[PDB]
Design an enzyme around this catalytic site. Structure first.
Site, short mmCIF file in Angstrom:
data_model
loop_
_atom_site.label_atom_id
_atom_site.label_comp_id
_atom_site.label_asym_id
_atom_site.label_seq_id
_atom_site.Cartn_x
_atom_site.Cartn_y
_atom_site.Cartn_z
N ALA C 127 0.85 -1.19 0.00
CA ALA C 127 0.00 0.00 0.00
C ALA C 127 0.88 1.24 0.00
CB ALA C 127 -0.94 0.01 1.21
N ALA C 128 1.02 1.88 -1.17
CA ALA C 128 1.86 3.06 -1.35
C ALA C 128 1.09 4.10 -2.18
CB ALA C 128 3.19 2.71 -2.00
N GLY C 131 2.84 7.02 -2.83
CA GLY C 131 4.17 6.66 -3.29
C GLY C 131 5.30 7.22 -2.45
N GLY C 132 4.99 8.05 -1.46
CA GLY C 132 6.05 8.63 -0.64
C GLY C 132 6.82 7.60 0.14
N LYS C 133 6.14 6.55 0.61
CA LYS C 133 6.82 5.51 1.37
C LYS C 133 7.81 4.74 0.51
CE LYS C 133 3.01 4.96 4.64
NZ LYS C 133 2.20 5.99 3.92
N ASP C 151 -0.76 -2.18 -5.78
CA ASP C 151 -1.88 -1.26 -5.66
C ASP C 151 -3.18 -1.92 -6.11
OD1 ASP C 151 -2.09 1.84 -5.06
OD2 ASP C 151 -3.53 1.41 -6.66
N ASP C 178 -3.92 -7.91 -5.87
CA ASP C 178 -4.47 -7.99 -4.53
C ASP C 178 -3.34 -8.17 -3.52
OD1 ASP C 178 -5.95 -8.33 -2.22
OD2 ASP C 178 -7.24 -9.92 -3.02
N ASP C 195 0.54 -0.33 4.65
CA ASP C 195 -0.27 0.80 5.09
C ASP C 195 -1.73 0.41 4.90
OD1 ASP C 195 -1.43 3.22 5.79
OD2 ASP C 195 -0.15 4.43 4.49
N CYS C 252 -3.57 4.75 9.81
CA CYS C 252 -4.01 6.09 10.17
C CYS C 252 -5.34 6.08 10.92
CB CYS C 252 -4.12 6.96 8.92
SG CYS C 252 -2.55 7.25 8.07
#
Lengths: 55, 87, 324, 177
Positions: C127-128, C131-133, C151, C178, C195, C252
Site C-alpha cells: 500500500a503506497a 508513493g512517498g513511502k 496497488d 491484490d 499501510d 491512520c
RNA sequence: GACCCUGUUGAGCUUGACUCUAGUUUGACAUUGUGAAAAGACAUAGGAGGUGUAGAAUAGGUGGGAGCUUCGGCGCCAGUGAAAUACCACUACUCCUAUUGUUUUUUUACUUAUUCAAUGUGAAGACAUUGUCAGGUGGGGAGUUCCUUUAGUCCCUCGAAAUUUGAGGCUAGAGGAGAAAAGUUACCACAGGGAUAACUGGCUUGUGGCGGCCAAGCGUUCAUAGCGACGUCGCUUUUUGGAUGUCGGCUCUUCCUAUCAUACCGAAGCAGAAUUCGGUAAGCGUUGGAUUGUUCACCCACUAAUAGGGAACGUGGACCGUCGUGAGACAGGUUA
C-alpha cells in the site's frame, strides 16, 4: 466587468447588464429598512439642540 | 480567469431549500462532449455537488456528501450558476 | 453526565453518536476535548527532501531564496522540513519540478523511519497510494536493491508511478494486484510494508467524511480486511536473511478495533512473530487490555501518535521479527 | 509476455543509437551474470533485468501493468518512440548534452522549444539533426530532442530563434495524477 | 472565417481466441555430515503478576456466595466501573530464575555429503551443487475452432465476529481466424475537398436568474395534459461603519436632449441660509492639474457650471516552392 469583457454577442451584453442591474436592485430592496431608520435619525440629529460642553 | 465559478446555487426539490454549495466536478454536458471534458457549464448540465452542509440522510441512516445537480440556467446569460439537486 | 457530554459533543461538532462513544472511551474528557479541537484544527504540511538528488541545507537555502518559510521538523527527522508560508506555489517551484522534494505529513515520516532498509535488499510495499513511502525507502537504500509496489486502483497507481519517476527511484516494479494475492504470487521479500486501509479516524481534517462516514458495519469489515492483510504480510516475510528483515504495520486509525487488536490476533495465530522496539522516539505506550480483551503484555513497545499531543496526524505503528 | 522480434528491436536500437553511444554498455553482462534485456508489454517496451523478467513472468498478462523502466511504445505504423520514462538511461549514456538556464528551463519544463537565450553552455561538433539531451545548470536531466541546427549555426543565429525541437520532458509525469 | 468531411500523423482507450508446454518461475524437502562456540523456542521445578478509563485500588478471569468473620478490618449498602470487591474453589497466560532436558538455527574448523582435477589417485569443500514435488506464468513452440454485468439461494464450504456479517460454491435475468496487427474518437499537426461571398437594419434603453407559494383565465373534457403575469419566500446577500492598447491632439460648423448652470414652478423638519428629489424647458454658456502606454474612476484648483451624445464613427499579406517531420527555416521567388 470581466463577464462583459469576455462577452461575445449583443444578447450576451443585454442579459449581463440586465442581470447586474437586477443584483443592485435586489440589494437595495433588502436595504429598504435601514434607509428608513437612517432617515429618521438624520431628521432628529438635524433637529437636535447644539450646546457647547466646554463653555 | 473570471469566467469560472467555484460554487453553485443548488435548489433541493424536497424540503424547499436553496443553498450555495461548492462544485465538486463536471460530469456530462449534453451539448458537446468536448465541453464536457473541459468542464463547460451550459444549461441543463449535470455536475457533482458537495451536499455535506444539507445533511440529507440516506439508507441505513447514513449521510451523503456528493450528489448530482442539473445546472438549469444559462450562466453565460446570467453569471450566477444555478442547479436543481437530484434526490 | 456522560450522556449529556456525548449529546453536547455530537451536536456541537457533528460526530456520529457511535464514533463519539468510541472516542469518549478512548480519551478522558480533557484529552477527548483536546483531541477533537486538534483534529478539527488543520495539520501543518511537511516536505521530504530527496537525498538521492539533493540535501537538506541546499534545499532549504533554495526555498529561502525563493521565499518559502521553513523550519526543521524536530531532531527526529533530518530529511523533513515544515512549511509556514510560500509566495511561489509549492507545485510550480523548480525544486519540486525536478524532484528535489515531496509534500507529505509527519505520519508519512514515521513508518518508513520505523523500517530500516539497507543496500541490496528486497522490499515490498502493498500500500503506497501516494508513493512517498516507496520513494523514501529508495532514498534510504540509495537506489540499491529491488522494490515491489502493489496497488488496487489504476488511478492512484498512475499517481504512484508519476511520483516514482519524478523522484527517480529507478528500481521499483509497480503492479495492480491484490495484497492478499501478492505473497502466493511472489513472496519471499526481505522487508514488507503495509499501510492498511482503515476507518481513517486519524485524519478528519484531510477526510471530514470520517466524522460521520463510518458506521458499525465498516468498523466490522475493515479490521477483518487488515487481519487478512497482516496474514499476507507475515506469509510474505522471510525468517532468515543475511540482513535482518522486519515487518512494519502502519495505519491512520485511532480507534482500538483497528489498533493493537489485529496485531494481537496475528501474534496469537503465528508464534514465529515477536515484536521488537520499533525505534520511534516520541509516542505513547500500547494498551495491555482495553475492553475486557487481554492483549499480550509485550505490546508496551507499540507507539501511538495523536494530533493533540504532537502536531502530527493520528497514526499507529507496529514492528515484528520472524523466527521460522 | 514476449521479447522483441527482429524489426522491432532493430527500430528500438536504431533510436537508442541515434540518442546514445554505449549500447554495448547497456546490453553487456554484469558481474552476477544477470543481463538487462528489452521487454515489451501492451505494445509498450520496457527495460528490465533478466532475473526481474524471470520473477515477473509468473504473473498473468492482463493483471501485470509495469515492469522495470518504460522505454516507449510503438505506433500503429510501427514507429518506435522513447519517452521521459526512458530519460534516465538516455542521460546516463548521452552522446550530446545541451545545458539550459533556469529562465529558459522553466518554459522547457512547460513544453516550449529551446531558445538560444535559454542555453547556458554548448556541446561541440553537434550534427544538425542529431539527438541530444537537455540538462539544467545542476546537471539534472530535463529532457531530450533533435536540435534545429548545428553549434556554429546556433552561434551565428538570432537569440530568439528555436534551438532544439522539444520532444518530451517532465510534463508527462504530472500529466497523470 | 467559424463549421463538416477525407488521407497521413500523433494523443489516446480497447481487443488481439481456446488447451498443453518450451522460456520460465515462487516456496519447501532431501542430498547435508562431525565436533566447538553460541542464541532462540518447546520439558519441567519454583518466585511475581494484573491501571485505557473511572472507581478509595495495579480489576487476571470464571463458578457459586452474602460477611467464614482471626478483626466487624471488611462483607452488605453505596458510588464508579463491560466486569466489585468478604470468602473458597477453579484454570489461563505471561515477566522471569534454575536446569530436571529436548529441539531448532547461525558461525567456525575438519573432511565423511556433493562436485571437480587427474583419469586407468588427489583436490575444493558442507559454500556451491543437483533431484523431488506444491504452486503461477506463458502472444514464444505444438494442437482445436468460458468469461462479462445483475439478483437470490443467506442453502453448503472457508473465515471473521461474545452469536451477526464477509469471500467462494449453487441458482436464474441480460451480453459476446486470433499475434499479423486491428477497431474507434464532436481531439492534435499537416495536405486537400465541401459550405457561407459578410453584418444589421421599426434593432436599441431602467429595473437578474433558479425553485416554491399564490394566481384570472385558457386548456385534452373541466384552473389541473397542463401554460400561466404582479407580488412573497430561499441562494447570491450581512449582528456593530482599480479596470483599461495603439492612437490620438486641437479647432470649427450644425443638430438632438436623455438639462451641469441660468429661468419657472410641485414635494421634503424645507426656522433662515445652504440644499435634495421631480418635472416644463436646448435661448444661453459648459475651464484645469495629478496620474498615467493612454483614458475613466478617485483625487484636488478655479468657475454660475465644468452634462451626455450624432453628423458613411462630420472640416482641416499567399502561394510556387527548396531544405526538415516528434518540431521549422529560407535574402528563395511569383508577386497581388
Amino acid at each position: 466587468v470581466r463577464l462583459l469583457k469576455y462577452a461575445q454577442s449583443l444578447y450576451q451584453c443585454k442579459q449581463l447588464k440586465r442581470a447586474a442591474l437586477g443584483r443592485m436592485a435586489t440589494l437595495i430592496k433588502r436595504l429598504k429598512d435601514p434607509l428608513i431608520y437612517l432617515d429618521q435619525v438624520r431628521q432628529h440629529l438635524a433637529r437636535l439642540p447644539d450646546i457647547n460642553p466646554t463653555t | 480567469m473570471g469566467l469560472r465559478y467555484k460554487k453553485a446555487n443548488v435548489t433541493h426539490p424536497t424540503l424547499n431549500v436553496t443553498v450555495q454549495l461548492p462544485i465538486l466536478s463536471v460530469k456530462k454536458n449534453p451539448s458537446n462532449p468536448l465541453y464536457t471534458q473541459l468542464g463547460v457549464l451550459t444549461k441543463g448540465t449535470i455536475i457533482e455537488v458537495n451536499v455535506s452542509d444539507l445533511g440529507i440522510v440516506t439508507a441505513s441512516g447514513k449521510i451523503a456528501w456528493g450528489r448530482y445537480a442539473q445546472i438549469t440556467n444559462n450562466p453565460e446569460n446570467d453569471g450566477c450558476v444555478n442547479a436543481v439537486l437530484l434526490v | 453526565y456522560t450522556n449529556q457530554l456525548l449529546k453536547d459533543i455530537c451536536a456541537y461538532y457533528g460526530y456520529n453518536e457511535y464514533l463519539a462513544e468510541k472516542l469518549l472511551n478512548l480519551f478522558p474528557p480533557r484529552e477527548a476535548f483536546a483531541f477533537f479541537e486538534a483534529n478539527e484544527t488543520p495539520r501543518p504540511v511537511v516536505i521530504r527532501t530527496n537525498t538521492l538528488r539533493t540535501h537538506r541545507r541546499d534545499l532549504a537555502q533554495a526555498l529561502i531564496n525563493r521565499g518559502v518559510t521553513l523550519e526543521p521538523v524536530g531532531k527526529w527527522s533530518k530529511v523533513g522540513l515544515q512549511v509556514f508560508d510560500s509566495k511561489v506555489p509549492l507545485g510550480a517551484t523548480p525544486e519540486y519540478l525536478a524532484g528535489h522534494y515531496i509534500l507529505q505529513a509527519a505520519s508519512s515520516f514515521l513508518p518508513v523511519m520505523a523500517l530500516c532498509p539497507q543496500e541490496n535488499e528486497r522490499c515490498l510495499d502493498m500500500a503506497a497510494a501516494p508513493g512517498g513511502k516507496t520513494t523514501h525507502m529508495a532514498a534510504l537504500m540509495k537506489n540499491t536493491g529491488v522494490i515491489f509496489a502493489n496497488d488496487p486502483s489504476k488511478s492512484r497507481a498512475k499517481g504512484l508511478i508519476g511520483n516514482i519517476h519524478r523522484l527517480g527511484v529507478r528500481n521499483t516494479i509497480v503492479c495492480n494486484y491484490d495484497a492478499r494475492e501478492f505473497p502466493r504470487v511472489i513472496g519471499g521479500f526481505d522487508r514488507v510494508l503495509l499501510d492498511a486501509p482503515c476507518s481513517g479516524t486519524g485524519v478528519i481534517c484531510k477526510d471530514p467524511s470520517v466524522k460521520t462516514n463510518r458506521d458499525a458495519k465498516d468498523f466490522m469489515q475493515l479490521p477483518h480486511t487488515q487481519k487478512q492483510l497482516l496474514l499476507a504480510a507475515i506469509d510474505s516475510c522471510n525468517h532468515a536473511s543475511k540482513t535482518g528483515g522486519y515487518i512494519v504495520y502502519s495505519t491512520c486509525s485511532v480507534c482500538v478495533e483497528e489498533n493493537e487488536e489485529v496485531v494481537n490476533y496475528a501474534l496469537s495465530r503465528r508464534p514465529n512473530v515477536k515484536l521488537v522496539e520499533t525505534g520511534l522516539p516520541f509516542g505513547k505506550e500500547g494498551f495491555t487490555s482495553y475492553m475486557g480483551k487481554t492483549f499480550h503484555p509485550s505490546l508496551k513497545l507499540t507507539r501511538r501518535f495523536y494530533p493533540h499531543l504532537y502536531n502530527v496526524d493520528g497514526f499507529f505503528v507496529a514492528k515484528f521479527k520472524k523466527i521460522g | 509476455m514476449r521479447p522483441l522480434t527482429d524489426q522491432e528491436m532493430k527500430i528500438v536500437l536504431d533510436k537508442l543509437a541515434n540518442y546514445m553511444t554505449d549500447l554495448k554498455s547497456l546490453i553487456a553482462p554484469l558481474e552476477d551474470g544477470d543481463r538487462y534485456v528489452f521487454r515489451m508489454q501492451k505494445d509498450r517496451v520496457y527495460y528490465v533485468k533478466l532475473s526481474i523478467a524471470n520473477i515477473a513472468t509468473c504473473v498473468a498478462r492482463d493483471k501485470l501493468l509495469s515492469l522495470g523502466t518504460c522505454l516507449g511504445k510503438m505506433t500503429k505504423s510501427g514507429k518506435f518512440r522513447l519517452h521521459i520514462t526512458a530519460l534516465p538511461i538516455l542521460a546516463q549514456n548521452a552522446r550530446y548534452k545541451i545545458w539550459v538556464k533556469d529562465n529558459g528551463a522553466q518554459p522547457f519544463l512547460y513544453g516550449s522549444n529551446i531558445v538560444k537565450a535559454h542555453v547556458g553552455r554548448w556541446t561541440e561538433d553537434c550534427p544538425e539533426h542529431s539527438g541530444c539531451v537537455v540538462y539544467n545548470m545542476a546537471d539534472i536531466p530535463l529532457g531530450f530532442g533533435v536540435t534545429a541546427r548545428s553549434t556554429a549555426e546556433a552561434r551565428r543565429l538570432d537569440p530568439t530563434g528555436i534551438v532544439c525541437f522539444r520532444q518530451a520532458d517532465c510534463g508527462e509525469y504530472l500529466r497523470d495524477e
